[PDB]
Amino acid sequence: RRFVLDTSVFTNPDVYLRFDEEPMQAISVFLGLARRADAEFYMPGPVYQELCNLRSMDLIGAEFETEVYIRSPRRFSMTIPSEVLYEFIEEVRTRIQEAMRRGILDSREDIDVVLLAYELDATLVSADEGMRKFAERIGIKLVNPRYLRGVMQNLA
Amino acid sequence: SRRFVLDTSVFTNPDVYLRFDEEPMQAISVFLGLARRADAEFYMPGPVYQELCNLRSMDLIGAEFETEVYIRSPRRFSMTIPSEVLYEFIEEVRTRIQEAMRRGILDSREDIDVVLLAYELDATLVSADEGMRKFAERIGIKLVNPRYLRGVMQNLA
Amino acid sequence: RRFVLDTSVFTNPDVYLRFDEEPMQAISVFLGLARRADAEFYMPGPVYQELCNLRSMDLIGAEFETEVYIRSPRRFSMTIPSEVLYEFIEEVRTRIQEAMRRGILDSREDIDVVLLAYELDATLVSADEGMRKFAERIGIKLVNPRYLRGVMQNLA
Amino acid sequence: SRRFVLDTSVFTNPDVYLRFDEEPMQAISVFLGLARRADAEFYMPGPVYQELCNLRSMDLIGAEFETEVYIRSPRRFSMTIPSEVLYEFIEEVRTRIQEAMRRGILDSREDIDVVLLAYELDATLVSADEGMRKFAERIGIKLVNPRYLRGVMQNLA
Amino acid sequence: SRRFVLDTSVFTNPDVYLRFDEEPMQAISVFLGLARRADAEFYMPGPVYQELCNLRSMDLIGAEFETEVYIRSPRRFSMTIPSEVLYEFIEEVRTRIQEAMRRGILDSREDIDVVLLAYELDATLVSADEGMRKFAERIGIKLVNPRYLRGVMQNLA
Amino acid sequence: SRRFVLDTSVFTNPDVYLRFDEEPMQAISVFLGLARRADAEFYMPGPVYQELCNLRSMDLIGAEFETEVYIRSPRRFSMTIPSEVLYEFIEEVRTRIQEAMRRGILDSREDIDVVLLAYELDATLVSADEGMRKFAERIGIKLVNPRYLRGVMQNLA
Amino acid sequence: SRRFVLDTSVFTNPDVYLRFDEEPMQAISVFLGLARRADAEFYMPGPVYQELCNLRSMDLIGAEFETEVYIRSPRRFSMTIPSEVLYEFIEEVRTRIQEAMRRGILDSREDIDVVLLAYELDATLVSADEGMRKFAERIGIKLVNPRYLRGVMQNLA
Amino acid sequence: SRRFVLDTSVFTNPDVYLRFDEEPMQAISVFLGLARRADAEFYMPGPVYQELCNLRSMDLIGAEFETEVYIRSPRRFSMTIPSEVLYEFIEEVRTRIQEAMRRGILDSREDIDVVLLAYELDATLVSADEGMRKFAERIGIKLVNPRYLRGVMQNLA
Amino acid sequence: SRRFVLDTSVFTNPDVYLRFDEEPMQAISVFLGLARRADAEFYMPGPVYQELCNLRSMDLIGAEFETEVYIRSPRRFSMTIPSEVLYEFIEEVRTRIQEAMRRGILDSREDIDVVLLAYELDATLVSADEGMRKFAERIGIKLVNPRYLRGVMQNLA
Amino acid sequence: SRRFVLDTSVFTNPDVYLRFDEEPMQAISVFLGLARRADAEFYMPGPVYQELCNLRSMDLIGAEFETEVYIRSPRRFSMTIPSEVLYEFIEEVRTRIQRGLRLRERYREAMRRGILDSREDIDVVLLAYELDATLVSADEGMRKFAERIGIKLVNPRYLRGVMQNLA
Amino acid sequence: SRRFVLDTSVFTNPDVYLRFDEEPMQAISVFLGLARRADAEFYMPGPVYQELCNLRSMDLIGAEFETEVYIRSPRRFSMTIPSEVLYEFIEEVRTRIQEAMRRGILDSREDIDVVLLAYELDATLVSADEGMRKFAERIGIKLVNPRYLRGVMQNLA
Amino acid sequence: SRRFVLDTSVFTNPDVYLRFDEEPMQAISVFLGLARRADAEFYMPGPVYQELCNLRSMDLIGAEFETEVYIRSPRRFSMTIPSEVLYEFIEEVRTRIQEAMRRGILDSREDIDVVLLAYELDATLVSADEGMRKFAERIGIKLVNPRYLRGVMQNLA
């Protein structure tokens, strides 16, 4: 059982919430659910750099890197149906909403994560819903990160 | 039979529009005359053709143009493309940052149509778009500088 | 590419429609759109039988089996994750709606088609929304029954 | 170190409840005494314990009941049971149909809880339900005729 | 391509044997004609062929039959059937009761050869035995109602 | 450690139980006495158990006979026997020709569970049935002549 | 296309080179003529070819023979026969007791080459040996009766 | 643990026989004393045990012998030997060209049971048959010079 | 039809290039004449063609040249080179040192485009970089001595 | 199990060399002590080991070192790197020659070391590629290369805290 | 089509090479004459071609030579021989005990080039080196007795 | 756990011979003592062990030696070495030039026994031959310096 995390897991309210009240204590409680769960959690490297730019520090980072595999996808030898590209175009549209940089980098981050999930045949988890629609049309299992903590529980 | 994939740049953008005719309708007609004589199969994505009709073409143009230029859908479904083609698409959009935004993104959509059609048929892409040129050069699609396209019509018998 | 069909594709409107106004010629134009493409269509045995008794007869059925493989899912020697069953539980909930036999049998053919798609790793098609959400939770490539023609065109 | 998985029917349904005692608290307490003297480990699904506490159990005794019996939920995620199981689920669903259908569905849900915990731990299932006993025999769970459950408790020293 | 596995019923039992021709051997020859013009391969296991050749097929037709129908017995080995398949097969021997036990067991042997062949090749079983057809359906064998068999070969060309 | 799969023939066949003791009920009792002291585990299929219960079993023995014998069915669901086994089973029906044919067919089911159970556990099969022991020897099951069963129980201490 | 695995019996058995012309070498020649117009590919394991040269064939036809008959030995290493074959193979060597024993061993090696080639290619085997055909019919090789070989190369052009 | 596989030779051929004890039966008895104190599991193919029990064993020793010797034939099915083995095998039967022929073949079947069992368990093949030792060394089986077998159970204990 | 893959050294390096002609434009022209008459196809990576266009080529010949020589760069994405190539590749960067920092990387980018394109198309590499020819021979690319290139075109009709 | 692929930088570059202990060899020793208890398996290719031995490690640690560090070279043969890697590799090799420069033999020698690092680094990265293992190294160039190719990464700053918290 | 893999012996050793023509260089030239008119394509490894080039081959034929004899070396990566080949190969070096030892190892490298190329392409190795042909039969390469090679190309036309 | 493929040099060459003890037999015995206390399994190919047994080992040491050092030969068949291993192996024999070439050939055979065994098992090949170490490094075998071997078995208890 393999899971593919996303930055929204530790950023989106009611997803960050329902984990814990404090940010770093929320990551710590996720860590506590991990290190005991039978599953393994992957997180693409750019997402890790994004998160570490916000709040992560050495003490919490040690646990986080022990429990979450920091891995970018096997960039190549992975082959997507043409669907994705055309489909992905629409995603970019929905992310126009100073805007261009963050929107395009966010879309690249989205594709990076969903590609990792597709490669590993793992379950992507992410709060953002356009990501969900894309990932279901490309063919990846999704778990609502609100219920992800419910999943780590009962999986320990 | 040496298959070509026609991007609409050859019918609009200058420096490749010229050397065919001074007049756009006669440039299209003379390109048509060079077609059906050279041992070639010209392909064009459907949206490109309909836009061309809305851009400049009229019905007398379009009838003969369809009769000789194969307007074919780029197998938009179940085509097995390699991964980073999407990342080159993102890098293109990053370079295509510049009502205006919608035109940019939809132009990107059409250009991707053309490139994917060429990739699928392995045909030779002809295009004036330099960014599309680098993207197609990296993806692995046969390229032609379209300033030679008329120069390719004859010399192709 | 591989697809897994279901009776809704030929019974429920919104996929009954836009194929053809006449039902038998709707199936026939679906047949003609196939018989040319590169995709393979499967249909579990009971599903096909329920379809056949009702509307499809000797005039069209020969063609139907010339293009569509009738195969019950390889029930035996296959494993599904346990949580599926509560998923199925909840599906039975959504089918509580005389109706006892209809609901139980419909869930029966539901799992027939779902497991066939899971084994073949194909792209399920079905009009019923509950089955669509079930497939999303289990992790099946699922496409809209109306999008199915739009896929057939651009394949033939 | 023999492992046992209990059931609602063990305590609540008579005909297996009897041969322990007639006053329910006395029988549950003598069951507590019989266990933890034997070399057995007892498991009981969590929600099943909660519903039992809703039926008869009181907080006076549960402390020792939670010392000897493990109130554990099944590893219901990441557990990969044979797919066909669900098929006879539906078969079983039929044999449980008889607004009472919601009660039947709750019964089915709890029965699956117990059976899946036993399949996870490979323990000896105990349950008075011939419906659940047949299912456990088919899927491959160790069984015990629960009328001999006390007769099992002794000889387990 | 598409693969078919045949049974002696296809060439012995009318109502699939008709729809080809009234006179039997000519119906065999007509099926020979329809195959080799279709885009499918046809397999038919060893013992079944021995039985059918004992019955009606003669030296004249045998040449074409072996030209287009691979007389091959299933891989006999290296094929791991699901365990309960055996149990299911028992049920057939349960229902095949009808001094004719030699015939009964030989029929069971030919039927299991045919079904296992259709299992190994993942081919399409065609047969008039309703008992075998339900077994093949439940195990997961691709099926074709033989009353449509001729109709299939026209639609493949 | 050491696992044994019984047959109800062991407690039923006249020749082998008497070595436990002259009284068949006392034979079962002394078998239980030898068990519970050996380092071995005893499994028995549900069908074989209930066929035995149709012979002699009552509560007095039944308690301990079910404590130190796991009445467990093979994991019929989700196990992969090899194909030739099925073919072999056919020839057993050739030996099981034995009015009585119905019983013979039921024989298969109960009998097959034993073998399957062993195959699943890689256990040690005990059965006075010559046909069963031949089938097990072909299929690859650990075997022990039941005439020595007592001694094998005796030495485990 | 279609692949045949010949055998030295096809040219050394009076039964099989009849149905070609009586002159046996010229029967080989007409066999070659039927090939090169058939849509098949005809293999013959190398030792079998050496045997055929030792007995009967020679240069003048030999050139054409090698043109159209891929003299290829089975890819012994990196091929996995299921183990039962070996016990099966024992049968053959047994019934190949029959100057006497060394010839039996050598023939057994030639026959195992032929059968393994037809097994590896999933080809069709032809041979006049009843033993070879029985062994192939068990292990799962395609068969074509060598009496009907001429008619099989015709209808195959 | 560590698993040995015994050929009957270790109880027949002196120097791997007398080293335990000069008399046959006390030799077997002291071997059984060494085992069941060693930390190894000892295996013997069924036919080997039949062959021995037809030579010397009597119901006295048989108890302990079947206590600490898993009598197990190879899982012939669901085991895929590599092809070239078979040719290997023939050479061994080749060497047995030397009544004797039928005995030679039966010995070959027993020997191949021993070797395939050792291959399947990846156990340690102990046997005095130098031909068997060479064959198993080539195929890749663990080996113990049976002259040291006694020592190997004084250790491991 | 053969596919040839051209390296810019074919036109630059006079040693290969004098035999077409002594003046570079006329030599390109005679090469163009030789092509379009051969049944072969000629390929050139886009970067290599650009580096050519910088040196001597101009618009006059370009068209005709670009009609006959397909300008395409290797499909970098969706290609799986083997690992030792990469280590081999370092050796090239090793020797490409000696105008200093960037010339070597330019050389290696063009060279690896060419070699990988030949690998992808399974075409025939024509080049004068003796190091590149050794590298292509090792990796497994076809080779034509460029000294003979003119002949190899004349002989292709 | 979890699998780590070391790089010699871990045992030469400070700020991962420290954070274990002060003394060099005793820093190696404390790293080993954190290993041999951790659930992970530590790989470190052959030539990397040779050079590390030539830098600091001597025989007094060697027994322990080879006890819990699988000195294994990448299975070069029978491994297929996707094509673009070779181009990507270019740019990484493109950078190292610039940091070699940015007096004749003085800048000449740095190029030699860069292009030999270009071989040791490729062994390490390919081992991590093949095993699907986690790559730890201080070379930001290697880290960015592995980020692009898709190797499991771990900051060597946390390496101690990774073998701690790993039993 | 019918791929052949040549060898230096085919053009050096007599008795195989006169059959084209007695005068050596013209014998090679008429070999090329037969080629280019056959429906066969002739590979030849790089080292072997260069070894031929040192001895006799000259400039005029060279052109025509590379017209049809594809000079390609075995893919040598991502090709997985079966392990026994290595041991097999040892004996060849053994038989090449026969300066001379360096010559022996160089010849062994060239021969492994040829045999591996034929193994990879599944082409038909042709070579007069008797040891090489025995090795090729064992490993499983097609073969064509080179004494017939001239014939093998005529009527292959 | 942690598998070590030993080698004859481990018990023949000082500096891995001497680090356990001074005299040969006592060094073997103390190595044997260190093993059986390590958590590591120690294989040794059959031919290598027979070579050692030729050199020094006798009954007294041999019993223990075979108790704890598995004497297993590589599973030659069904192992797929990648191609250039063979080519790599080539120059190893080159470097083994050193009447006397027979020793080099046999050394090569046993060395490939050891290295292949380690490759198959994915063990930690210990060896003193620096050529073997280099070859095993390039191919991708684990390694530990035999100079440290004693220490490695300690620190591992």
Numbering used by the authors:
A (entry chain L), C (entry chain A): 2 to 98, 131 to 189
B (entry chain K), D (entry chain B), E (entry chain C), F (entry chain D), G (entry chain E), H (entry chain F), ...: 1 to 98, 131 to 189
J (entry chain J): 1 to 102, 125 to 189
What does the paper say about this structure?
Ribonuclease P (RNase P) is the essential endonuclease that catalyzes the 5’-end maturation of tRNAs.
Here, we present the homo-dodecameric structure of the HARP from the γ-bacterium Halorhodospira halophila SL1 (Hhal2243) solved by cryo-electron microscopy (EM) at 3.37 Å resolution. Hhal2243 assembles into a dodecamer in a left-handed screw-like manner, with each molecule being rotated by approximately 58°, except for the interface between dimers 1/1* and 6/6*. Upon completion of the single screw turn, the first and last dimers (1/1* and 6/6*) encounter each other at a slightly larger angle of 70° (top view, left) and laterally displaced (side view, right); they cannot form the same inter-dimer contacts as dimers can form within the screw turn; the steric clash between dimers 1/1* and 6/6* terminates oligomerization. Hhal2243 consists of a PIN-like metallonuclease domain into which two helices are inserted that we termed the ‘spike-helix’ (SH) domain. The PIN-like domain is formed by six α-helices (α1–α4, α7, and α8) and four β-strands (β1–β4) that fold into an α/β/α domain with a central, four-stranded parallel β-sheet. Two Hhal2243 monomers align head-to-head with their SH domains consisting of helices α5 and α6 to form a dimer, while two SH domains form a four-helix bundle resulting in six spikes that protrude from the dodecameric assembly. The dimer interface covers a buried surface area of 1300 Å2 and is mainly of hydrophobic nature with two clamping salt bridges formed by R141 and E91 from either monomer, respectively. The covered interface between neighboring dimers extends over 900 Å2 and involves the long α4–α5 loop of one monomer and the α7–α8 loop as well as helix α8 of the respective other monomer. Application of this method to Hhal2243 revealed a stable dodecameric assembly of 295 kDa that included 98% of all molecules in the sample. Our Hhal2243 structure supports the prediction that these residues constitute the active site of the protein, including an almost perfect superposition with three of the four active site aspartates of AtPRORP1.
